[PDB]
Amino acid sequence: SRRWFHPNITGVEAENLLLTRGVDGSFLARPSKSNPGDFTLSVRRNGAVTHIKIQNTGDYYDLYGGEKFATLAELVQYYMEHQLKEKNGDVIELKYPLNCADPTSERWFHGHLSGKEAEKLLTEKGKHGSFLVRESQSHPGDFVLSVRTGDDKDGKSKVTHVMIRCQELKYDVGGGERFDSLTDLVEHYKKNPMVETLGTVLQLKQPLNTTRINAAEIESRVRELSKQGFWEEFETLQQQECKLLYSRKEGQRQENKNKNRYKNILPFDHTRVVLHDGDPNEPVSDYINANIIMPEFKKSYIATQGCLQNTVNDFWRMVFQENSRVIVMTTKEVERGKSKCVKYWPDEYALKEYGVMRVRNVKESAAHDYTLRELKLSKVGQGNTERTVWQYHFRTWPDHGVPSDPGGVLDFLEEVHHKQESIMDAGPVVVHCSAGIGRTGTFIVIDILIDIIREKGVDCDIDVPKTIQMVRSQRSGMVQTEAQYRFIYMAVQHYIETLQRR
Ligand SMILES: N[C@@H]1C[C@H]2CC[C@@H](C1)N2c1cnc2c(-c3cccc(Cl)c3Cl)c[nH]c2c1
Numbered sequence: 001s002r003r004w005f006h007p008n009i010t011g012v013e014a015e016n017l018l019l020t021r022g023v024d025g026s027f028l029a030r031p032s033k034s035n036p037g038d039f040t041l042s043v044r045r046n047g048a049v050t051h052i053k054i055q056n057t058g059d060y061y062d063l064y065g066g067e068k069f070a071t072l073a074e075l076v077q078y079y080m081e082h083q084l085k086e087k088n089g090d091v092i093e094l095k096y097p098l099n100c101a102d103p104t105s106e107r108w109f110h111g112h113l114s115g116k117e118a119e120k121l122l123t124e125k126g127k128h129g130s131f132l133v134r135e136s137q138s139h140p141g142d143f144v145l146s147v148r149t150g151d152d153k154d155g156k157s158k159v160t161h162v163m164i165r166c167q168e169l170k171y172d173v174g175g176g177e178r179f180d181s182l183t184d185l186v187e188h189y190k191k192n193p194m195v196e197t198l199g200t201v202l203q204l205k206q207p208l209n210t211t212r213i214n215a216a217e218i219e220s221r222v223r224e225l226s227k228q229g230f231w232e233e234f235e236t237l238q239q240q241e242c243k244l245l246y247s248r249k250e251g252q253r254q255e256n257k258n259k260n261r262y263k264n265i266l267p268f269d270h271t272r273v274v275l276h277d278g279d280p281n282e283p284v285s286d287y288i289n290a291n292i293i294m295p296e297f298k299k300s301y302i303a304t305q306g307c308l309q310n311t312v313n314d315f316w317r318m319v320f321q322e323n324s325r326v327i328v329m330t331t332k333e334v335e336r337g338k339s340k341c342v343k344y345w346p347d348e349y350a351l352k353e354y355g356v357m358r359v360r361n362v363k364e365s366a367a368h369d370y371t372l373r374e375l376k377l378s379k380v381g382q383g384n385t386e387r388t389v390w391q392y393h394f395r396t397w398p399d400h401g402v403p404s405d406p407g408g409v410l411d412f413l414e415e416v417h418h419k420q421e422s423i424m425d426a427g428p429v430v431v432h433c434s435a436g437i438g439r440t441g442t443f444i445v446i447d448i449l450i451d452i453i454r455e456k457g458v459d460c461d462i463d464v465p466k467t468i469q470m471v472r473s474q475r476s477g478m479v480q481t482e483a484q485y486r487f488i489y490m491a492v493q494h495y496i497e498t499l500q501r502r
Helices: 011-021 072-080 115-125 182-191 215-225 229-244 254-259 309-322 407-421 439-456 464-472 482-501
Strands: 026-031 038-045 048-055 061-063 109-111 130-135 143-150 157-167 170-172 272-274 287-293 301-304 326-329 351-354 357-366 370-379 382-394 429-432
Touching (some): 072 229, 115 130, 115 143, 272 287, 287 309, 309 351, 309 357, 309 429
Parallel strands (some): 326 382, 326 429
Antiparallel strands (some): 143 157, 157 170, 351 357, 357 370
16 A cells, blocks of 8 residues: 555665666655655656655655645555656656565564564563564574464463565465565465464454553653664554545535645545534535544544635634634744744734634733733624633744754643633634644644643553554644654653653
């Protein structure tokens, strides 16, 4: 599904792969592994190889001479069904993904790991059908598939080790088919499980979970990941984004095209915020580029983009309808001279109408990292509909990368949390600006994780990539970069430490 991404290939290796194993229309994507959030799309055309840069500074994937995308999988899906051009404007066709054989980004691949370590991990964390593949230590170059089976409710469970031989670049389990990569082998024995002579089915149901940690042991995990293990954990997460190609048909409708900041960054249909009670004289009045984010799908969120001038009225309709009482903005109005979050609220002490909605800005309060605006929102003609909406505008996030210290983000989220908790029956917290996926995804995930710790204490389990994958199933590409990924771990660590300091 995403075998076209090669995490460990060089540019020359990419050319040699396309020229020797590809044809015209063959393509792959790869990182620039030194430089953060640089990728290359390498494409064979007329017997030569073109390299197209994709940049991600934290907000979206920006394909040079193309469009902006929420994930590389959504990028590849878009051009494999459509549009891509060179500097000189010639069409570059993405026809044939050139598949990677490298197992390092697979959830089940542990690399160097002994049989006793694999048994201990499968014993402590595994259940029936949990498996992993590890390098062989007795027969170098070969591999071992280790699988737990049993009763998950004293000998009722066991671990089986199946030897995987590598013989001339192909892989086998001692007989039958010979596979071009470990992934093909694992996929085959996932669909067609091995059976032991005496009948046990070696069911490959789920990879062994290695990312769930006790929150108390965050500092140790961050230490191991900083030896660089954050990269591999992040790329293993990125590999699974091909499971999240959910439909975005509503956002693609002609009537909704100009309601999106970027034409291809769109809300999933199954989680989009549907706007009711619109003008009956607008044919399509139900659409905003926003998704409900419900953790492990009390506190929920709406993740959305910065307004366009023609969606400000819809944004207020959304806040009103959903009963939201707290807004987080993740960008300044302008960064690098470019509009990142258009002003949609009145000046301090002023009152404005935004279609059927009326907003008063009661008071602004400046703090070091943010500005708070106390807004009163009501429906025109209906005085008794008024409610206070507290807008927390984060203003110190750097123009590129992530904050060097998570303290400001954490203090801000602590205040936002208490505000939300103080208001009976407050609806979801709105988090937005830019495309509403990078910084927005980062703030939401931190907030989710820190809320578990706040209620359960240091002695509770957290799983950073599993949480992110759960949020990415509700809006495309929530958490854009490895720098934001590492920043989430750092924020959880700093939160745990400040709570041990008190
Ligand atoms: N290649 C390896 C990278 C390290 C080291 C061993 C193992 C595999 N390990 C790992 C395992 N699992 C994940 C996940 C993940 C966890 C829950 C749900 C989903 Cl969908 C995902 Cl992708 C993200 N990163 C991981 C890294």
